């Protein structure tokens, strides 16, 4: 408890987060911890909040980490308190939703898409140099700015029963093998996948069925080819190869002309506005 | 939306008014009391309410009883009877069972299956995880979250259900498949009861399923050590001919399960994987 308490109390504040924050209210689904969103009182700043509290764990160190190495592209550490038998962690929040309200209640232009590959992109090439490998990129965890704004947020055994479908899952993730960051830039093209279809691949699928199909086809089957751009189609070919070392690499894909055809962050605006009023 | 308010109307909105027993995925599970009781919680579809469903309407003395539910939006409460004997699998992984041991399991859960097809009803995930124990060395199987109701109308499914290295030839290719898949199921767990693992464990899961699409029938590491009438009863419940695979009315009668000893003799298994268990901890 000495060495986990000690480091903590480096970085935590002092301080009561009961009257720093208001308007709490709940979002996560902790494990690990509840998640609340709440409005910074003094700033008005609107903020996530894990509160938990034990085995053991990593906390302090990643939080650590989070502390030092920040970047937009992604939900950031802002703060921490010991809260009686509890920790809190803050966090930024954004208040534009999902990709994956845009992705359900709107048709995403190759402009649009674009844009948000290259934030993305723009995220993991910072998490792949720090060795964070992500392991869940999905339009569930891809949060939107009312400004357009893009960060990514939210970063097992043989004999259990597989209840959802891991359709983001590179090849050599649901095979079982060694893997690396490339497991993102694979997770990605699926994502892009999905915002031209307007869904997830292998819907229609068990997940065994779809987990043979990802292990041995690779890349789900396009459901309509002609509709995209030569160049769009040349993006996803490189995020999808099977072979992990001609599956590009977050600093390559940064360069892919692709990303060179994305609009404007304000162009994104429009589709929180049509997915906020459809649900 | 449907989904959730067909959910919802199944739910006893009563008051449910908080002990442990360990948290598993999908979602943690919970011990309590008001008859010892089990409860889980899980703050998410179809496959608790098939669950649900179909453990209501199938109340068995070889099937965990399912007792009422309780609904909070956010998370899904569940509420069975609590067998304190832990699963089979602490006791195949941590013992050595004797004939007569796995006999008596054997028929206990050939006893659940025969009245569970003759329900209509396919369990699809039957294995050593889904198998509860009581104190008194009770048998009792668990998991219809994968169960299919079938009829006359739709006798078969074609689906890959269940879990790779218990799934039965036909499944793991898709064919039309019936009741007879949880008899394959049943002789993988009686490998488990004799070796301590289903086939091809050290395998990954897509590799397992190739290799029941291509070997069949599973190979014994030691089929010298066996009785000749426990691999006869072996061989019936895992044939790749589903016609001469046995059902589970025929394997009832089988003489292997003549051999079965009391269920009491479960009692010292239950008592070996609980020590076991402990000094795996330390
Ligand atoms: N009615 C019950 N009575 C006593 N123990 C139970 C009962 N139900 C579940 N358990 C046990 O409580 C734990 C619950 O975790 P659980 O996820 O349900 O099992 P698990 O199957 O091995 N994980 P999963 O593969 O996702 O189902 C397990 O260890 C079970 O053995
Ligand atoms: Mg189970």
Not at 245 to 264: N, T, V, W, Y
């Amino acid at each position: 408890d000495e060495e986990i308490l000690e480091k903590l109390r480096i970085i935590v504040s002092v301080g009561d987060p009961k009257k720093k924050y208001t308007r709490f209210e709940k979002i996560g689904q902790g494990a690990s911890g509840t998640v609340y969103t709440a409005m910074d009182v003094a700033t008005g700043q609107e903020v996530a909040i894990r509160q938990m509290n034990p085995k053991k764990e990593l906390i302090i160190n990643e939080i650590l980490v989070m502390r030092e190495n920040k970047n937009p592209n992604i939900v950031n550490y802002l703060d921490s308190y010991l809260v009686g038998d509890e920790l809190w962690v803050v966090m930024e929040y954004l208040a534009g939703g999902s990709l994956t309200d845009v992705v359900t209640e709107t048709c995403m232009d190759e402009g649009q898409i674009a844009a948000v590959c290259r934030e993305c992109l723009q995220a993991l090439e910072f998490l792949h140099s720090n060795q964070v490998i992500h392991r869940n990129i999905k339009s569930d965890n891809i949060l939107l700015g009312m400004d357009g704004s893009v960060k990514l947020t939210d970063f097992q055994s043989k004999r259990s029963t597989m209840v959802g479908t891991p359709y983001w899952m590179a090849p050599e993730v649901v095979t079982r093998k060694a893997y690396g960051p490339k497991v993102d830039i694979w997770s990605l093209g699926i994502m892009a996948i999905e915002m031209i279809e307007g869904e997830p691949p292998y819907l229609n699928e068990n997940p065994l069925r779809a987990l043979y199909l990802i292990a041995t086809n690779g890349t789900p089957e396009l459901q309509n080819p002609e509709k995209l751009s030569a160049i769009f189609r040349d993006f996803l070919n490189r995020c999808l190869e099977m072979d992990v070392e001609k599956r590009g690499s977050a600093k390559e894909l940064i360069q892919h002309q692709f990303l060179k055809i994305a609009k404007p962050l304000s162009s994104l605006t429009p589709l929180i506005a049509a997915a906020k009023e459809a649900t």
